[PDB]
Each structure stands twice: as C-alpha cells, then as structure tokens.
Design an enzyme around this catalytic site. Structure first.
Site, PDB file in Angstrom:
ATOM      1  N   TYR A 124      -7.416   6.195  17.641  1.00 47.22           N
ATOM      2  CA  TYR A 124      -6.701   6.435  16.390  1.00 47.22           C
ATOM      3  C   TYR A 124      -6.428   7.936  16.205  1.00 47.22           C
ATOM      4  O   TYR A 124      -5.315   8.383  15.926  1.00 47.22           O
ATOM      5  CB  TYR A 124      -7.537   5.888  15.198  1.00 47.22           C
ATOM      6  N   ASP A 173      -2.789  12.664   8.966  1.00 50.48           N
ATOM      7  CA  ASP A 173      -4.137  12.379   8.532  1.00 50.48           C
ATOM      8  C   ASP A 173      -4.840  13.715   8.352  1.00 50.48           C
ATOM      9  O   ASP A 173      -4.964  14.469   9.312  1.00 50.48           O
ATOM     10  CB  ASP A 173      -4.855  11.502   9.581  1.00 50.48           C
ATOM     11  N   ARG A 201       0.808  -1.212   0.000  1.00 52.30           N
ATOM     12  CA  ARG A 201       0.000   0.000   0.000  1.00 52.30           C
ATOM     13  C   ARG A 201       0.841   1.262   0.000  1.00 52.30           C
ATOM     14  O   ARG A 201       1.783   1.365  -0.791  1.00 52.30           O
ATOM     15  CB  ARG A 201      -1.002  -0.089   1.169  1.00 52.30           C
TER      16      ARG A 201
END
Ligand code: NAP
Ligand code: NAP
Ligand code: NAP
Ligand code: NAP
Ligand code: MCV
Ligand code: MCV
Ligand code: MCV
Ligand code: MCV
Lengths: 248, 251, 250, 251
Positions: A154, A141, A13
């Site tokens: 998370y 993120d 990935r």
C-alpha cells in the site's frame, strides 16, 4: 458549457464527497465504481435530480492487468462521450489492506499497486492524450513516511503516486494541465475497523482529536481544481489535523 | 564462516562494483544477472580466482509477472544453496528508459519492467530474504537522488524509485524486530548510459557542484559497504545521497 | 462583527496583495511596514475608503535584537487596540540578500535575515497565541526553493528553513487552542526591484507552468484558502505555489 | 602530516565520542567547550597520553551575540595555531530545552538556542572556509532526525535544527567548488539527559524499532567518521539519520 470531472471510486465515502462538491461547484461528473453499482447510481440519481443530465456512472476494475490500459482509456472516453470534454481527473479509488513481509502476493501487488499508482498513471496518460482550467488531483496519504506496520505494498503504491504527481506535473505543464495531490491523515475510518481502534487513531490528531470528514478532504480538492490554484502544480496538500507532525 | 550477499544486476557497472567491494570485504557473493551472462561469469571467475568457491552467478528476469515471487525466492535460495546463509541483499537491478505520457514495448510491458525491477522485485526479494533468516543482516536498496526533480518523460521509472523509498521505510520498520536493517543509497549522476553521447554526458557532469563529474561506481559501492558494516549498526530506514550536491542545484 | 488580520511587510508586493484579498474577504487589517510608510498609509486609505475603520498601519523593525520581543508584542497589541480581536497572523515581511561564505557587518546580516524570516515570526506567534464560531490561524510565507537554494544565500535559507520548523512546531503546540498554523511557499513570484531584466527573464523561463512568475494575487489566493473555512482541518501544511519550478532539475 | 579537526561541545557525551574517534583515526583535535573545563582538559590529557601534542582545548560561548563572529573565528584560528591546518569541523555543541509558546528571558533563549544550533555553525563554517580560500576537507553538522516530528514546546530548538539543515545544504552547494564537503548526522534518541529518570528514558527507548534502545555516542560518532573519510568523497549535502527507525514510527 459546464466543465466535466471524472472521480474514481466515487460511490462512497471520500470519493462521493468529492463528486458531490464538484457537482455543487458546477461540474458535470463521471462517477466511477468497481463493486458499488447501487451506491454509484443512487448518487447519480441525486445529482441528476438537482441538474438533469449532469451525472453518469462508469464501471471498471482498476487492478493491474493486461486490460487495465483499455479500462482507463474507457473511463476517460466515458467523460468525453457524456459531456464532450474532460477538465478534471480525480484519482481517488484505492485498495488498502496489510501485506506482511514475514489472495496470492501477485494479486495483492496487482490490486494495491494497480489502484494506487498504475491506474492513476494510465488515466493520466489517457486524460492528457485526449486534450480552460485542466487539472488532475491525486488522493495521496499524509502518513507515507510514517507508515502503518505491515502495509508495505500500500505504502509503495502511495509513494509511487507521489512520484506520478511530480513527474506528470512537470511533463504536462506545457499543456496547461496542473497535477496536484491531497494527502489525508485519518479521515473516514475503514468500515471493518473496530470502534476502539478508531478512537485510538482519533485521539492522536492534534487538531480536535477527531478524523477529517470526507467534506474537509473534498474542500482541498475543490481548491486545487479552482481558479484560485492556477499557479499550483506538483503540490501535495496535507489535510491531516497535524497527525503527521506527532512523534511516536 | 564468511558472510554471504546477493547483489542483483551485478554483472557490470554499479552492481559489479558493489559485488567486488563486498567480496574484497570478505563476503561470498551471488552475482545475479538477466541478460549479461558473459559478463556475470567473467566476474565470478575473477572473484573465485581471488578466493575459491566465493562467487556464483544466478540468472533471473525481475520483470513483474505471476512467477516473479518464485523467481525472487529462488534468488535467495541460490545464496543459501551456495553458501549456507544470506546476510546481505542489495537491490541494484533496474530498468531505466522513458515512458512519455503524451505520444516497441506495450505499456503493460513497460509497467512490468520499470515497476517490477525497481519496486516489486525488491519487495519480493525482501520478503524471501526475511522469511529465510554476532549477526549483521541488512538490505540496501539502490535509490535515486533525483526522484523529486525527475528527468522529463520518465514517469514510470520515477514511480518505481519512489515506491522503492516506500519499501525501504516500510521494511525498515517491520523488519527491525528481526535485526534486519533496511537502507538505501541514492546516486545522482554516476555511470552514464552506454548509449549516451559524450556531449550529453558532459552536460550532466557540469551540473555537479562537487568536481563537475559523475560518481564512480566505487564511490557508490563505498556507501553500500558502509551501510552493511558494523559502523552502521544503528542505521535503518536511512537513504544516503551520493550525488556531489547535484540535487541541491536549482533549475 | 468582522475578523481582524495582521499582515507583516504589507505595504507592497505580495504582502499588499494578501492584505487586499483579506480585506476583500471581510477582514479588518493591520498593515505592518518598516520603511515603506507612504505605501502603507496609501493602502490603509484605499481600504478604509472601501469600508471605514477597517485598516490601520503599524511600523516596526523586525531585525533581531533584545527589543524585538517588545516590537512583536506591540504589533499584535495594535490589532487588539484597533479592532478588539486578532484572528489571523500572516508572517510575510522578509529580508532577502546574499551573504557569501567566502556594507553591513555579519552580525547585522544575521540579525536582519534570521530576525525577519524566523525570530520575528516566532515572537509574533507567541504574542498572537498569548492574546487569545472562531477560525484562528497563522500563515507563514515560506520558500519553495529551500532545498535548492540560491547560491550564496545561506543566512536567508537558514531563516526560511527555521520558518518551516516554526510552522510545524507551532501547528503541533497550538492545535489544542484551535489555532492552525500553515505556510505558503512561492517559487518565483515578484522579482526583486533591483534585479536586472535579463536575470528576471532567466528565472521566468525556468518555470514549467507558463514560463512566468507568480503574480502577487496568486500567492495571496493560497493564503486566503488557508485562513478560510475550507481549510479547517489543515494545520502544519505548506502549500507550494511555484508553477512546478522546484520539480526542475539543474 | 596528520590532519586536524575542530569538534564543538566536545567535553562530554556525543561530542567527546566524536573527538575520541577522530583522534583514534589519526586526527589532531581541538576540543571546544563552554562550561565543562575539567572534562575538556581530562579528554585532552587522555588523548595526549596516546600521542603527544595532538589535542588542545578551546573555550567559548556560542550564544548569539555581537561578539559571536569573533569567537567563531578564534576557534578556527586555534586549530591553525595548534596544528597548522584545519581539515574537519564538527558542529556538535547545542543548547536544548523547552520554550513554550504560551504561558531566562525570551531574547536569551533565542540567542542560546538559535546561536548554538545555527548561527555559530554558520560563522564557524565562514571562518573555516575563509582559511581555505591529498586534501579531504569537510564539515559535519549534528542535526536531529526528529525535526519534522518535534518534541512538544521545543519550537526554538526545532527552528535552530531546521536552520542547520538549511546551512548544511547551502554550504554544501557554495563550498563544493573549493572541495569542502558539508554533511550532517541526525540522531533520533541517543544519550538521554543525565537527570532523566530511567522510567522516562524507557518511554523513548521502547519507541525505537531497532533494538528498543538509544544510540550510543560511539554509534553517532561512527557516522561522522564515515562522512569525513575517503569513502565519502562524493557525498555532500547529505544528512544521515542514525535513529534505529524512530522517525518512521507514527504516533
Ligand atoms: N480514509 C482515510 O482516512 C484516508 C487516509 C489517507 C488517504 N486516503 C486516501 O483517500 C482516498 C479515498 O479514501 P477512502 O477511504 O474513501 O477510500 P476507500 O473507501 O478505501 O476506497 C474508495 C473506493 O476505491 C474503489 N476501489 C477499491 N479497489 C478497487 C479496484 N480494484 N478497482 C476499482 N476501484 C477500486 C472502491 O470502489 P467500489 O466501492 O465501487 O468497489 C472503493 O469504494 C484513497 O485514495 C485513500 O488511499 C484515505
Ligand atoms: N547510473 C546512474 O547514474 C544512476 C543514477 C541514479 C540511480 N542509479 C541506480 O543505481 C543502480 C545501478 O545503476 P546502473 O546504472 O549500474 O544500472 P543499469 O546499468 O541501468 O542496470 C543494472 C542491471 O539491471 C539489470 N536489469 C535491467 N532489467 C532487468 C530485468 N528485467 N530483470 C533483471 N535485471 C534487470 C541488468 O542486468 P543484465 O545486464 O544482466 O541484463 C543491468 O545490468 C540502479 O538501481 C539505478 O537505478 C544509477
Ligand atoms: N518574491 C518572490 O519571488 C518570493 C519567492 C519565495 C518566497 N517569497 C516570500 O514571500 C514573501 C513576500 O515576498 P516579497 O518579494 O513580496 O517580499 P519583499 O518585497 O522582499 O519584502 C516584503 C517586506 O518585508 C519587509 N522587511 C524587510 N526587512 C524588514 C525588517 N528588517 N523589518 C520589518 N520588515 C522588513 C519590507 O517592508 P518595508 O518595505 O516597509 O520596509 C518589505 O516591503 C517573503 O516572505 C518572501 O521570502 C517570495
Ligand atoms: N542526545 C541525543 O539523543 C540527541 C538527539 C538528537 C540530536 N542530538 C544532537 O547531537 C549533538 C550532541 O548531543 P548531546 O546530547 O551530546 O549534546 P548536549 O550534551 O546537550 O550538549 C553538548 C554540549 O553543547 C555545549 N553547549 C551548550 N550550550 C552552549 C553554549 N551556549 N555555547 C557553547 N557550547 C554550548 C555544552 O558544552 P559544555 O558542557 O562545555 O558547557 C555541551 O556539553 C547535539 O547537536 C544534539 O542536538 C542529540
Ligand atoms: C490500520 O488501519 C488504518 C490505520 C491508519 C489509518 O489512518 C492513519 C486508517 C484510516 C483509513 C485509511 C488510511 S489510508 C486509506 N486508504 C484507503 N484506500 N482506504 C482507507 N480507509 C484508508 C486505517
Ligand atoms: C536521460 O539519461 C539520463 C539522465 C540523467 C541521469 O542522471 C541524472 C542519467 C544517469 C544514468 C541513470 C540515472 S538513474 C538510472 N537507473 C538505471 N537503472 N540506469 C541508469 N543508467 C540510470 C541518465
Ligand atoms: C537571486 O535573486 C533571486 C533568485 C531567485 C528568486 O526566485 C527563485 C528570486 C525571486 C525573489 C525572491 C525569492 S525569495 C524572496 N524573499 C524576499 N523577501 N524577497 C524576494 N524578492 C524574494 C530572486
Ligand atoms: C525531553 O527530553 C528529551 C526528549 C526526546 C529526546 O530524544 C528524541 C531526548 C534525548 C536528548 C536530546 C534530543 S535532541 C538533543 N539536543 C541536545 N543538544 N541535547 C540533548 N540531550 C538532546 C530528550
């Protein structure tokens, strides 16, 4: 002498794409993995076919534990052992799953906060201690301030990683070590995610109504480690097709 | 019936000021403490003298461990045991010390204390608080206005405080349906460390545009009391800086 | 055939470095300027000597006024007139000076500071979009210190905050047209020509990464990345190029 | 003696609620309006029925123009002429409508949207401070919680609101030595447009985690009251979201 990079969670990935692009740019690479030995070796084999003895693998669990510091020291050591130097660290490995407020919770803490924040911190320490265009790139993120529902742990881990990126950029600047982040929005969707849920996410993205390829994420990493980013430190580059700009 | 609040690390300094102000507002309070037993009991005594049976103490280490979830659960349980309800949780307790990246405590212990107190314990306490629940339920997290311009060599502390911003947001989102608001108060420079010399204190003080002084503990408590009040009943996921402009001042 | 870029305030300093790097990458360039006619023409000369018919100058005042929309339309028009296309817009031109809250009138200060930093970028973005294998994008020169601003620079700071808002709003609205909109945010780069050496050195010593200001070329490097094929999923992003300056507390 | 406040765009909706709450708190008020004369006067008469000579109205267009500085100076001057002092300025008046990038003149749209949301606040701030060249002086700017996730095609509005954030920070820093605090209140979805169909109103309401409803004007006013109060005297350069968690909700 070619520079050398460590990429965590590099078997598949996004991590794989980053390893490949660094290698294509002329780096020798340490391909770190936890469970994906077969895929890690397959990648090494492919890279070593292109240039002999330019790729090695390194196994470690990055869950928080009493042995994590030693594991992270050994990942950095593996780069110095193989290549005699360590110029770039890419903190890519990451656990990702929901942890509703209302696996034991302590194990969830260890995995989510360990992989996303504590291991990056310890790897950062070991990288710096062992020391030209030195830099660290943290995979952040873009959605940290508009988080997925029920992903508290998370999200906490990814926020901590922002904090590490800033704190380490400040503290390691005197050593000429830059510390930056790349923040994907929606890139490669989880393998376990259903096709309908995947398309729901893709249609939210302003720029093309599709997810980022792993290569597009890797492109930002390559920029940040390059000589074109020599004054850039403590910066986090969103690579999200405008997804974070879209209101509810 | 009077509402009830848990304040972590409430024996002294900002935590005490928050407990005192909640109590003055009509709350019954759980004064959580770790090492400061004498100070915790002294505070509870003062408060119970004002109104009988309105303050209890609760000891717990909030360092991360495999039993931390049980400890956090027991803190919330202690509020229900004493007072039959738990309306407010204030996550104030916090380890704060440098952790240099390049070179007493093992790194494992430093991670456990700094991340445990500032982030993991808040998360577990939030879980337990929610699991136990006309009404005005809320959580206030003591954050840090300087998280984006952090003190040199305080990476783990800073990581913990960033994680706490993340919790504040994630928990606000997820607990909204339960009517539990989740907010933060972000001091800049308030009460300086006891170990800090006056010269170093004055260096910090003279950086603050609004009055060249640190926030009093009461000033921090004032923002907490606002956020728990009916005057903030549409406010969730908000972090209020109480920093006298410090975070606006460039290098 | 080669893509074309408009760079505002391109005659000197960072805008010139951006124009030069775009040109070196293969772009034809419109070198916009206001007062620096000699420097603008000299740069166009240098670039055309390297590749003929690849550079033109375009003069315009970017102060806010009722004619500013026409001026901005004319800048974009000049790119189409010279090159038949307009692929990249770099909003670099900028007035920068103090406006304390307690020679120019306040209405002129508002016009200059808000016009150059925010309204002209908006109007240029409008005209750029309206005139539109391709890789179309806009890069706005922002400021890494917008949240820790210089004392008594309220109007400048307002302009740069507005430019962040434009970058975001335009990224959102123009994404369907394949036009990406990003920013580059310097901390301390080329110091003002009027600044005294003592104050220059004061700023330099604050920068963690090298205790020195960014070169113009370092700022240009980030612009080049954002307009490139290696940024094709990037929109609404502002990249700080500040050597960690914005991380440093008071 | 009673303090005095200027509230811009105070005839209706959020500005009216702010003016009312300030008046209920003990402030004398200047009710600024542009087009809503009857509503402004109706409010003034209501407030003066409560306490004589405590409310006046002030008409002005806050569109950007060559005369805007004078207009803003006159608004502040009105407060001094009426009440002998000016303790609080609330920048609430705001033009709000779409300005698509791709197909009123555009220069008028610029003037209205950037004037009302940013330039008039800046000029009012200048004038407020220049007249100040026990006391609790402060400015509250009505911002927008959604500035980083804006409505499609509202670029000039969003630019104006971002500029207002800049002003809030820059003026906090610069005016702190004079004791003038400068803060914001950032609604998400509060009172929806009057013409808007309930079915469209509900699309927005359903997005709000905390109660699936918009903020009342009074809830927005509550945050302004806090910020101007004695409980906020260390708070400057802070923007308090009052958004029910809306801004935390991903697409
Ligand atoms: N994909 C996206 O849309 C997206 C969006 C935002 C941010 N990101 C970030 O970008 C990065 C890459 O994303 P991705 O989707 O490619 O990641 P991923 O597939 O979820 O995880 C990458 C690797 O992390 C490793 N890992 C997981 N738990 C570990 C543990 N306990 N110890 C050591 N390694 C562990 C795994 O290695 P093994 O397979 O060898 O076990 C896994 O292959 C991550 O940091 C992610 O948070 C991705
Ligand atoms: N003071 C400031 O200028 C400032 C600035 C920014 C943010 N803040 C934040 O505001 C809050 C209050 O600040 P403060 O200075 O009053 O805090 P503090 O004195 O440093 O610490 C408060 C309490 O935290 C508790 N604590 C520490 N380690 C613990 C552990 N392992 N387990 C359980 N409790 C533990 C201690 O309780 P015992 O004494 O009982 O052991 C201590 O009294 C903190 O969250 C802090 O980060 C403060
Ligand atoms: N230099 C830094 O340390 C720094 C730091 C942060 C951000 N930035 C940003 O990066 C960009 C480049 O900085 P710089 O220092 O190179 O800029 P600069 O020299 O201050 O200005 C660039 C050009 O802007 C043009 N300009 C000024 N007023 C104008 C007006 N009314 N109409 C049209 N053009 C006008 C001028 O063109 P003429 O000379 O032709 O009149 C000037 O040469 C700017 O947006 C700046 O805000 C710079
Ligand atoms: N309502 C919301 O959901 C929401 C959400 C986010 C932020 N906000 C902010 O909160 C504040 C109040 O919102 P609101 O909905 O109550 O505002 P609004 O009704 O849209 O406008 C308030 C007043 O602004 C005045 N105004 C408009 N253009 C003017 C001009 N050119 N010159 C002088 N005054 C002018 C008008 O006064 P006259 O009627 O006398 O003409 C109007 O009554 C605004 O700053 C807004 O941006 C509101
Ligand atoms: C509910 O599942 C979701 C919801 C939203 C998502 O993007 C906005 C994704 C993409 C995958 C992802 C994001 S962070 C992340 N981190 C890791 N380590 N792995 C991943 N695969 C992802 C999945
Ligand atoms: C190097 O020592 C410093 C440097 C900067 C500081 O404020 C800008 C302070 C104030 C004390 C403090 C800040 S977070 C914090 N957190 C806890 N749990 N305790 C504290 N006492 C503090 C101390
Ligand atoms: C007090 O003078 C200052 C203070 C801080 C500065 O950097 C942090 C600079 C660098 C020049 C600058 C920053 S934005 C900017 N914008 C334009 N259009 N031009 C410039 N020359 C600059 C100057
Ligand atoms: C398309 O109409 C919309 C879309 C989203 C909205 O809330 C997120 C609103 C609420 C009204 C509003 C927000 S800022 C604002 N500002 C002013 N000066 N007036 C208002 N009435 C509003 C209306």
């Amino acid at each position: 002498e070619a520079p050398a990079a460590v990429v965590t969670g590099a078997a598949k990935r996004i991590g794989r794409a980053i390893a490949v692009k660094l290698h294509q740019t002329g780096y020798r690479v340490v391909i770190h993995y936890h469970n994906s030995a077969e895929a890690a070796v397959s990648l090494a084999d492919e890279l070593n076919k292109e240039r002999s003895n330019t790729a090695v693998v390194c196994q470690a669990d990055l869950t928080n534990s009493n042995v994590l510091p030693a594991s992270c020291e050994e990942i950095i050591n593996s780069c110095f052992r193989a290549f005699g130097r360590c110029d770039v660290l890419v903190n890519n490995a990451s656990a990702f799953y929901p942890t509703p407020l209302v696996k034991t919770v302590e194990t969830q803490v260890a995995e989510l906060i360990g992989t996303n924040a504590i291991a990056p911190f310890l790897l950062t320490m070991s990288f710096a201690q062992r020391q030209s265009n030195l830099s660290i790139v943290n995979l952040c993120d873009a959605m940290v301030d508009q988080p997925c529902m029920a992903f508290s742990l998370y999200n906490m881990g990814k926020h901590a990683l922002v904090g590490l990126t800033q704190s380490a950029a400040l503290e390691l600047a005197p050593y000429g070590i830059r510390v930056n982040g790349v923040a994907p929005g929606v890139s490669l969707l989880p393998v376990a995610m259903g096709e309908e849920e995947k398309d729901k996410w893709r249609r939210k993205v302003p720029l093309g109504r599709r997810e980022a390829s792993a290569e597009q994420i890797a492109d930002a990493v390559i920029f940040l480690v390059s000589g074109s980013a020599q004054y850039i430190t403590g910066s986090i580059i969103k690579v999200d097709g405008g997804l974070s700009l879209v209101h509810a």
